[PDB]
Design a protein around this ligand. Structure first.
Ligand SMILES: Nc1ncnc2c1ncn2[C@@H]1O[C@H](COP(=O)(O)OP(=O)(O)O)[C@@H](O)[C@H]1O
Ligand SMILES: Nc1ncnc2c1ncn2[C@@H]1O[C@H](COP(=O)(O)OP(=O)(O)O)[C@@H](O)[C@H]1O
Lengths: 325, 148, 547, 325
């Protein structure tokens, strides 16, 4: 069946019938700073070559028009000394534009028109250099790759903790670098029909993450199983343990947000768990172990799971049995 | 249709044979034409079969509806359901029309790309003629046959 | 300073090709908005393409790179103008248009300087044509800014892209695409590519456009029928011709232009052969362009004829279905309103009227075609035209008499088949009682007798069509033989260069093809006549009386 | 009547009698990085040309004053070799300033005053180049355009959900790029008179956004109708359904905040709904649909609305009827 957002974190829902009013290009550089590296490098070299060829053509033409292009000895001084053909003119254009300044061909004080073309060439060169540096730097603050290094366990299990049904999922870090003030927004989606006859195709509802006195966020050093307790007030509380594996369509997504240390940008990661991915009545294997003088974490058992003799029943019926026991 | 088809296939055979005779080099430029045309014909075949099948499957219920309306007249004009039945017939005829329209549009598309193929073949046939049969072959009578 | 002006022309093409690449690369890395002059813009752009090909020909004849570079640059400039206009049709802007307008003005200036410096002293005609085309495109741009919002006061009052062909679930878009694509059905690509990946369904295929629904066709048709009545079998025919109208006329105009170009081709053959006997590659390029153009316009004509036909079918179907309501059962008791008769009406009249309305635009171009054929072959034969003219005049009246003798058999054929179908209907719905006490032999011999009469009609038709094809081949070959023999030795004393011979054969074949076709056309023509007579007698049944 | 903040998101209230103490210009570059592109490009070219002309004048003068400007053969070497007129001097200024370095005119080791003018020319050039790059980059982090791409439905409807009156409004995204940790601040304004005789011309009050256990923020993938339930405690709970359409003056604004992924800046969007914009007793059409293997969203029905037979009464009277039923 159709998934809401894919495991890799990319969004699945394909958009249709967007009334484009042009804002897609109106974000001129915040559009292309999104692109890949080959496309952005291609369009940067094309910017540079476009400008260089434009001014090389205009210079070729101005040297042709002054008549300094006509090879002649005396009665003149070329506006640009030692210019012969188009090739040397393009060499002059790249010599003055990108500010190497070879000086074999000298622009002279006889023609003020060449002064004007230089005084606009250089400023446009400097402006396009300034933007083509700022945008590549604004790019190198792409830290979604740091959204790649995070990992979640492939499937999530539920258990019985403290006499109440609980669901456990793992997270973890993959580098030395921490993520500042990460917060968890844990959401459930379902095609819902209201008592008013209103049917929604998809209905996001927050399920709380259960920490100390409150709080939406967590602290990530070692793999920490996130711990929620479904109660009669919770939206997930009504389902049955035998109807989840095959038929029902329930996506439980988690969105972890946080700002990486060194860049300072705020990244996040998104993952979905389907009704066929989740399973019932198990327990993860303890990862952390007291090694020689530290805590060793073994990621081989990250996705490992052991059987646990826990009663199998619906959370509504389990709450009724708790009322009975 | 059968006689026109036979006439056209024999005309095609004659034209290919003539062009091959006038320029023995054209057999280097015929296989790419044949390959591209073969692939596009194969792609058109399945879509055409699908559109024809859908045409038939929409054209049957419209005539069933017509017959049943014609025979069971008294009941339909007794209930005074005529608006409902006219709306139903509008639905069926619109679906029939769109099916027919897509069939003929696919036909037109295949014809256009085939005509572009024919333009390619006549172009480079005439080009190899004007080049070879003049510069290296130096033959006069074959040019008219080839281009005709 | 010729090279100086050549360079001055090269500059603006370069400017535009350089500004186009950032935007084109951002755009390359579902609402269609159309602007006034779009079709005019594309037509003018194709004319520019043609004139640029001619300029490249001039540059080849002269050669000096800098002397023919302007054409090679305007080529990419016009293609990039097309790319810009595609990028603007897909997403509207006020600025990209000004970006085009600047280039148009500068190119006009450079061409004007060229024209002046030439006047002070083949090139002349090409430069003038380019000037006129660029000026008309400039006027189109001025119209576009005058319309909505180039700079004009504050808000465009912009159209609100058309919901007819772009709102909810439109899976078919012939009217909802660009000028250049309608001819090639480029839009179809996706669809045909999609069909192979997943089988096709009715919910897969879309709905019908605003201007394609049978409701609007029935509306137009009834309005025209009312207007005709306020002013019978002939009346509804007049109403049909009125209703399709301009689309049908356009299909005919496209076919006539395609015909003139189709004749133009053999002339290029003549020129090529003449230079081979002695400005030749130009003949090949121009011939290729001409052939491509004929094919494009022929296929467009066929498409629009099919459109008119399907709309006809829808409209007359819903008209007869509305009239079945007011039909009284006292007609239903009679043989005229037999249920089988009415369903035969629907099915076979759909078929016959659609086929005649596909073949009618084809014959509305036979007269112009033959006229242009003879006016072209005069200038090629000379005094030897008399023979071919006598042949193609002797063809016509015998063909008219043959067609008459054919139609007479065909109508009786239709009557006999129509009675056979009702005999089969009343034979199949009672096969139980028929086989019960075995009355089979009687009904089978009756259907056999009806089949024999129908077969008599068919064999008359077939013998007449065989004689028709015999004539349509024998008269042509005799014509060719007589004309050539007459030119070489009989009188002319001017040796027919092979170019004349092959061009005559080509024009002659082009003339021959319609004659074979018209014989098949009569089969659909008398059938359309019979179908409309039947439809008008069906519309003339007794009404239901309002209280 | 007068609107609080316009639909486009710009603020309407015009400020009067600002005691300017000069901080408006004291924000020297955080002022001009706000400007449009033509003005900022104009002031950058004017900075560059101003500096270039200043130093070209001082160089012209120094070559004049040394007497090297007086054309003479021998008994001297010009401080700058091959300098003749003002034009060539301005060419020297742009040659050394913007670091092309043509070298046709050579500054020599005979005059230390020219060394001083060069050693200040270059450092001022480098400083003004550094600022004129940093500020243009600080500009290209204008992501308000990303505040442009967000969209809200033109008018908002109220309904009856779960036996209680509810108000529904749509939002949505217009690109692939997500917005991190978007939060909703939903506010109502009204000219209010306290029981103490105090009259306020405008009174902002928070109306909660109703999500799971709590939370101020949401997750935007597909168009999500925001769901609040007005209760007896809510400030909007007192109005009448027939008095809203014409007479009353009630602006309900929503402010959605969030940080865009690639730049990392925090953008927001603001919109108002007037008493004449909002309507009563309707329901939006379901956008999301299960297509071939995904979820298709159709934005044509984004602003579409269907009639629903719901009772029409005041929320106070509806709460009294709920007490009665
Ligand atoms: N040893 C490891 N080190 C780092 N990352 C891992 C390791 N093993 C798995 N992962 C990643 O983290 C997730 C852990 O899933 P897990 O429960 O181990 O299932 P499995 O073992 O089948 O991958 C996997 O999706 C995988 O992408
Ligand atoms: N198809 C579309 N794609 C993208 N944006 C749209 C589309 N239609 C409308 N919008 C924008 O989003 C808002 C949706 O409003 P809506 O309820 O559709 O009213 P309307 O249809 O009258 O614009 C509008 O203000 C408009 O600016």
């Amino acid at each position: 069946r159709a998934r809401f957002v894919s495991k890799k974190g990319n969004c699945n829902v394909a958009h249709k019938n967007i009334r484009e009013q042009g804002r897609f290009l109106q974000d001129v550089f915040t559009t292309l700073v999104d692109l890949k590296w080959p496309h952005t490098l291609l369009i940067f070299t094309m910017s540079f070559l476009c400008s260089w060829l434009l001014f090389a053509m205009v210079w070729w033409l101005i040297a042709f028009a002054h008549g300094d292009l006509a090879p002649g000895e005396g009665t003149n001084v070329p506006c640009v000394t030692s210019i012969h053909s188009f090739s040397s003119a393009f060499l002059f254009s790249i010599e003055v534009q990108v500010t190497i300044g070879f000086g074999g061909r000298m622009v002279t004080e006889e023609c003020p028109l060449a002064i004007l073309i230089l005084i606009v060439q250089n400023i446009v060169g400097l402006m396009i250099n300034a933007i083509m540096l700022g945008c590549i730097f604004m790019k190198t603050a792409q830290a979604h790759r740091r959204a790649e290094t995070l990992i979640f366990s492939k499937h999530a299990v539920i258990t019985l903790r403290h006499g109440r049904l609980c669901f456990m999922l793992r997270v973890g870090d993959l580098r030395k670098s921490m993520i500042i003030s990460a917060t968890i927004h844990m959401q459930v989606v379902r095609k819902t029909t209201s008592p008013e006859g209103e049917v929604v195709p998809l209905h996001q509802v927050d399920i709380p993450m259960e920490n100390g006195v409150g709080g939406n966020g967590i602290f990530l050093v070692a793999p920490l199983i996130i711990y929620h307790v479904i109660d009669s007030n919770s939206p997930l509380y009504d389902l049955a343990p035998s109807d989840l594996h095959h038929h029902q369509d329930l996506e439980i997504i988690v969105i972890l947000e946080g700002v990486v240390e060194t860049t300072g940008i705020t990244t996040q990661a998104r993952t979905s768990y389907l009704a066929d991915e989740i399973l019932w009545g198990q327990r993860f294997v303890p990862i952390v172990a007291e090694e020689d003088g530290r805590y060793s974490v073994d990621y081989s058992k990250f996705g490992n799971t052991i059987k646990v003799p826990t009663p199998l029943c619906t959370a509504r019926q389990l709450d009724e049995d708790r009322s009975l026991l | 249709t059968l006689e026109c088809l036979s006439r056209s296939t024999l005309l095609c055979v004659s034209a290919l044979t003539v062009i091959s005779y006038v320029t023995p080099v054209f057999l280097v430029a015929l296989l790419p034409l044949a390959v591209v045309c073969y692939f596009i014909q194969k792609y058109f075949r399945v879509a055409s079969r699908d559109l024809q099948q859908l045409d038939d499957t929409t054209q049957l219920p419209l005539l069933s509806h017509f017959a049943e309306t014609v025979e069971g007249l008294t009941t339909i004009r007794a209930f005074r359901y005529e608006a409902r039945f006219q709306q139903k017939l509008l639905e069926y005829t619109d679906s029939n029309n769109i099916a027919s329209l897509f069939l003929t549009a696919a036909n037109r598309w295949l014809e256009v790309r085939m005509e572009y193929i024919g333009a390619c073949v006549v172009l480079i046939a005439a080009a190899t003629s004007i080049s070879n049969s003049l510069h290296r072959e130096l033959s006069a009578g074959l040019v008219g046959l080839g281009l005709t | 300073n010729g090279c100086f002006v050549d360079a001055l022309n090269v500059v603006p093409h370069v400017f535009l090709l350089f500004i186009t690449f950032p935007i084109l690369f951002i755009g390359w890395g579902s609402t269609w908005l159309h602007f006034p002059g779009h079709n005019l813009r594309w037509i003018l752009t194709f004319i520019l393409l043609f004139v640029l090909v001619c300029e490249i020909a001039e540059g080849i004849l002269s050669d000096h790179l800098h002397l023919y570079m302007p054409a090679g640059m305007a080529f990419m400039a016009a293609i990039t103008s097309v790319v810009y206009y595609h990028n603007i049709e897909t997403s509207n802007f006020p600025k990209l248009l000004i970006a085009l307008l600047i280039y148009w003005t500068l190119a006009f200036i450079t061409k004007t300087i060229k024209f002046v410096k030439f006047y002070d002293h083949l090139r002349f005609c090409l430069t003038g044509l380019l000037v006129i085309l660029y000026g008309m495109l400039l006027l189109v741009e001025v119209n576009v800014i005058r319309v909505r919002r180039y700079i004009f006061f504050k808000t465009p009052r912009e159209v609100k892209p058309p919901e007819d062909l772009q709102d909810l679930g439109v899976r078919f878009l012939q009217p909802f695409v660009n000028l250049l694509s309608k001819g090639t059905y480029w839009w179809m690509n996706a669809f045909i590519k999609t069909a192979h990946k997943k089988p096709i369904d009715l919910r897969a295929i879309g709905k019908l456009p605003i201007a394609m629904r049978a409701l609007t066709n029935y509306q137009r048709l009834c309005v025209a029928f009312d207007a005709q009545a306020r002013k019978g079998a002939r009346a509804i025919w007049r109403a049909l011709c009125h209703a399709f109208g301009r689309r049908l006329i356009l299909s005919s105009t496209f076919r006539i232009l395609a015909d003139l170009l189709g004749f133009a081709g053999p002339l290029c053959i003549f020129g090529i052969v003449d230079h081979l006997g002695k400005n030749a590659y130009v003949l090949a390029v121009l011939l290729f362009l001409a052939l491509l153009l004929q094919r494009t316009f022929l296929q467009a004509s066929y498409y629009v004829a099919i459109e008119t036909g399907i709309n006809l079918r829808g409209a007359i179907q819903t008209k007869i279905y509305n009239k079945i309501m007011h039909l009284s059962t006292s007609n239903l008791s009679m043989g005229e309103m037999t249920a089988g008769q009415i369903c035969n009406l629907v099915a076979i009249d759909t078929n016959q009227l659609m086929w005649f309305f596909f073949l009618c635009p084809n014959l509305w171009a036979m007269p112009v075609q033959i006229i242009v054929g003879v006016i072209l072959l005069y200038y090629i034969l000379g005094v030897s035209a008399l023979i071919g003219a006598a042949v193609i005049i002797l063809l016509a009246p015998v063909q008219y008499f043959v067609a008459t003798k054919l139609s007479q058999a065909q109508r009786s054929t239709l009557e006999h088949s129509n009675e056979r179908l009702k005999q089969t209907n009343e034979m199949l719905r009672g096969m139980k009682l028929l086989k019960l006490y075995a009355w089979e032999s009687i009904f089978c011999s009756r259907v056999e007798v009806t089949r024999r009469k129908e077969m008599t009609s068919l064999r008359a038709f077939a013998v007449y069509t065989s004689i028709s094809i015999f004539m349509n081949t024998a008269i042509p070959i005799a014509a060719v033989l007589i004309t050539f023999v007459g030119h070489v030795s009989f009188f002319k004393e001017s040796d027919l260069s092979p170019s004349v011979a092959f061009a005559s054969l080509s024009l002659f074949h082009i003339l021959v093809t319609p004659l074979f076709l018209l014989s098949s056309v009569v089969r659909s023509t008398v059938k359309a006549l019979v179908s409309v007579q039947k439809l008008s007698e069906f519309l003339s049944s007794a009404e239901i009386r309002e209280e």
